[PDB]
Amino acid sequence: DLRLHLLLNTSVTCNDGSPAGYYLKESRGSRRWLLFLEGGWYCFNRENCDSRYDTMRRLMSSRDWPRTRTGTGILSSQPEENPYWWNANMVFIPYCSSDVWSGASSKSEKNEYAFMGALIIQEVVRELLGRGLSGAKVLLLAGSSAGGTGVLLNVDRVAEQLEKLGYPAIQVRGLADSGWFLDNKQYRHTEAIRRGIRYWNGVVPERCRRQFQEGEEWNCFFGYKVYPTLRSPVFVVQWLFDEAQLTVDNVHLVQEGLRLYIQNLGRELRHTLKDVPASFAPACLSHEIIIRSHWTDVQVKGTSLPRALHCWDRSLHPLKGCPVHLVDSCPWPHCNPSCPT
Ligand SMILES: Cc1ccc(C)c(OC(=O)c2ccncc2)c1
Ligand SMILES: *[C@@H]1O[C@H](CO)[C@@H](O)[C@H](O)[C@H]1NC(C)=O
Numbered sequence: 001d002l003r004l005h006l007l008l009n010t011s012v013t014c015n016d017g018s019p020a021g022y023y024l025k026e027s028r029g030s031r032r033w034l035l036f037l038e039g040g041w042y043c044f045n046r047e048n049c050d051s052r053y054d055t056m057r058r059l060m061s062s063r064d065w066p067r068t069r070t071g072t073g074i075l076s077s078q079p080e081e082n083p084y085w086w087n088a089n090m091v092f093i094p095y096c097s098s099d100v101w102s103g104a105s106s107k108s109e110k111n112e113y114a115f116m117g118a119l120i121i122q123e124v125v126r127e128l129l130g131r132g133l134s135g136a137k138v139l140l141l142a143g144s145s146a147g148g149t150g151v152l153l154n155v156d157r158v159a160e161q162l163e164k165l166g167y168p169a170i171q172v173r174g175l176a177d178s179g180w181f182l183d184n185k186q187y188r189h190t191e192a193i194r195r196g197i198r199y200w201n202g203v204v205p206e207r208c209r210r211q212f213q214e215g216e217e218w219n220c221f222f223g224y225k226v227y228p229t230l231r232s233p234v235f236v237v238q239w240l241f242d243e244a245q246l247t248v249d250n251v252h253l254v255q256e257g258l259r260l261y262i263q264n265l266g267r268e269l270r271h272t273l274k275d276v277p278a279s280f281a282p283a284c285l286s287h288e289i290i291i292r293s294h295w296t297d298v299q300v301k302g303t304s305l306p307r308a309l310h311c312w313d314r315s316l317h318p319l320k321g322c323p324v325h326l327v328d329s330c331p332w333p334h335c336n337p338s339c340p341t
Contacts (some may be wrong), residue, residue, distance in 0.1 A: 027090070032137065143177065235324075242286070
């Protein structure tokens with residue numbers, strides 16, 4: 001079990017002004033630290049945030065959080081469940097800012113809600129340095145869905161923060177799960193991101209911001225555009241037929257037009273990953289994420305995700321029998337027999 005700690009700086013808050021926090025399980029025989037960002041869509045104006053506050057309140061508030069959580073999948077401490085990093089120090093950071101981990105805006109006389117995702121990550125890191133993170137060799141910033149996009153937006157800021165605080169020996173890396181989206185044409189008929197950034201005072205990585213310039217920061221929420229601007233090593237996990245991508249595209253899984261649309265989407269996703277040397281992209285229709293207990297089952301070309309992640313660790317010390325670039329080439333959901341059932 002991971003134990004809850006509410007932030008000691010109580011001005012770094014969830015949407016409703018309650019303190020943000022993190023769940024921690026220490027492993028004193030390890031210098032590896034895994035910090036996982038929870039996902040769960042976002043809200044982008046007063047009216048849709050009010051609706052989320054009525055029926056998704058744990059994603060906007062710490063008032064009802066439980067004292068403990070069980071680590072699962074990549075956050076499990078059992079070797080059978082987690083062949084990759086079972087002995088690491090484990091951190092789960094709840095998503096209570098509704099801003100894709102991008103916000104830097106406090107509640108005030110003009111703001112009904114606080115959007116502080118980018119500042120929550122910074123404050124968690126700062127408070128962990130006093131609890132053993134100061135001695136780490138590797139900090140892996142991981143996350144799923146909105147948390148996976150959050151990794152892409154924040155990994156280089158964590159690296160810069162640790163450099164400026166005087167910890168240049170900690171190697172910062174990212175693991176983005178299910179957060180690599182395409183700004184494609186819908187099957188039936190990006191503005192939500194543009195509106196959100198303004199409402200949240202959202203921030204994006206500086207090298208990407210300098211390319212797209214003022215007003216066009218929404219581009220940096222798209223992995224294929226932001227990834228080439230990043231300096232930290234990043235491993236990308238993405239289903240070729242991701243269910244959230246299909247939802248945004250107004251597809252609900254077939255006649256000829258939809259067959260062509262689905263095949264073209266898988267081809268486009270594969271194309272965006274061609275020059276991503278550390279990646280795992282199975283040809284499956286899924287919303288399943290890396291904290292699920294059976295995450296070990298899926299394989300690409302005979303290699304599982306825990307194995308590919310281990311090979312990535314070795315590569316940061318190509319390797320014989322230890323691949324890190326694993327992208328399916330077959331063109332239809334479940335053409336890989338190991339897809340989640
Ligand atoms: C679940 C989730 C979390 C965060 C983001 C940014 C998501 O993607 C989009 O909002 C988006 C995708 C493609 N075209 C336009 C918009 C989806
Ligand atoms: C608490 O966090 C805010 C926002 O990052 C910061 O401005 C403030 O200085 C912090 N307080 C302390 C005591 O560090």
